[PDB]
Design a protein around this motif. Structure first.
Motif, PDB file in Angstrom:
ATOM      1  N   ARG A  44       6.519  -7.335  -5.004  1.00 30.85           N
ATOM      2  CA  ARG A  44       5.736  -8.299  -4.428  1.00 30.85           C
ATOM      3  C   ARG A  44       5.131  -9.161  -5.632  1.00 30.85           C
ATOM      4  N   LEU A  45       4.972  -8.921  -6.864  1.00 30.47           N
ATOM      5  CA  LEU A  45       4.563  -9.655  -7.785  1.00 30.47           C
ATOM      6  C   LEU A  45       5.714 -10.594  -8.363  1.00 30.47           C
ATOM      7  N   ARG A  51      -4.034  -0.608 -11.494  1.00 32.24           N
ATOM      8  CA  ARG A  51      -5.403  -0.737 -11.516  1.00 32.24           C
ATOM      9  C   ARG A  51      -5.700  -2.457 -11.815  1.00 32.24           C
ATOM     10  N   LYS A  52      -4.707  -2.700 -12.781  1.00 32.69           N
ATOM     11  CA  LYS A  52      -4.902  -4.267 -13.060  1.00 32.69           C
ATOM     12  C   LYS A  52      -4.583  -5.093 -11.683  1.00 32.69           C
ATOM     13  N   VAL A  53      -3.701  -4.718 -11.291  1.00 34.34           N
ATOM     14  CA  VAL A  53      -3.047  -5.412  -9.909  1.00 34.34           C
ATOM     15  C   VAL A  53      -4.447  -5.483  -9.117  1.00 34.34           C
ATOM     16  N   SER A  54      -4.731  -4.312  -8.640  1.00 34.16           N
ATOM     17  CA  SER A  54      -5.887  -4.181  -7.822  1.00 34.16           C
ATOM     18  C   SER A  54      -7.162  -5.083  -7.930  1.00 34.16           C
ATOM     19  N   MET A  55      -7.432  -5.130  -9.435  1.00 32.58           N
ATOM     20  CA  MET A  55      -8.612  -6.095  -9.755  1.00 32.58           C
ATOM     21  C   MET A  55      -8.083  -7.436  -9.840  1.00 32.58           C
ATOM     22  N   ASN A  56      -7.056  -7.685  -9.498  1.00 31.83           N
ATOM     23  CA  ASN A  56      -6.610  -9.050  -9.703  1.00 31.83           C
ATOM     24  C   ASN A  56      -6.423  -9.816 -11.132  1.00 31.83           C
ATOM     25  N   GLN A  57      -6.477  -8.840 -12.134  1.00 27.59           N
ATOM     26  CA  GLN A  57      -6.300  -9.022 -13.565  1.00 27.59           C
ATOM     27  C   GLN A  57      -4.914  -9.410 -13.835  1.00 27.59           C
ATOM     28  N   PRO A  58      -4.740 -10.386 -14.738  1.00 32.16           N
ATOM     29  CA  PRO A  58      -3.283 -10.613 -15.246  1.00 32.16           C
ATOM     30  C   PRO A  58      -2.434  -9.365 -15.781  1.00 32.16           C
TER      31      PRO A  58
END
Lengths: 118, 118
Positions: free
Chosen positions: B107-108, B75-82
């Motif tokens: 991929r990160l 969910r953090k990655v989906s919202m582009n949150q660090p």
């Protein structure tokens, strides 16, 4: 109602609603909505909740069956809800609430209404 | 996103909204709104809240700085949150969440991603 008919009040509130104000009735703060929700989705919040809790007699036995707050009684009469008003009514106080309660009790058929003031 | 682009999802949700369905986002049940209010002002209430709490490692030290839930991380990655993803990532589990977390960590930029399954 005998001092302020509610048709006039309804007309003036309709006038306010005609100006773009939206009134969400039956929406109590802290039950239906929270303060934090209002803070989150509104730029400003104004609180005008009034003083809607009546003062008890402050004496032993002030929780019996047959003691009622003045504004609770007046709110019950305003909504046309049943009130267990006997034939001997004692209104304690000397403010506008006491006078309104006494005169409403007179108009509700009470044979004796007495007002007691400190 | 590499398995389901969100433009397609947005388009389909717009299609559903075009049928007269109104979606009130950022409105959590029990925080912004209450169940009792929904019961009061709606004929029916359907609850489809999903399973949005991840399972902890169930071992001592599973509350350190550097342990995160799979769906919380996704969910953090989906919202582009660090996300404080290091260079050695251990994904515990063998489900779809574990695979998605491992491939997203790859991929990160994680140099080593390992999946541990019971």
């Amino acid at each position: 109602e005998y001092r302020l008919p509610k048709g006039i009040l309804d007309k003036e509130i309709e006038l306010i609603e005609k100006m773009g104000v939206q009134i969400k009735t039956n929406m109590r703060l802290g039950v239906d909505i929270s303060l934090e929700y209002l803070r989150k989705n509104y730029d400003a919040v104004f609180l005008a909740v009034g003083a809607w809790k009546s003062s008890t007699l402050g004496c032993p036995g002030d929780s019996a069956e047959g003691v009622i707050g003045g504004i609770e009684f007046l709110r019950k009469v305003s909504m046309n809800q049943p009130v267990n008003l006997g034939q001997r009514v004692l209104v304690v106080g000397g403010g506008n609430t006491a006078m309104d309660a006494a005169r409403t009790a007179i108009r509700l058929g009470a044979k004796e209404v007495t007002v007691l003031y400190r």
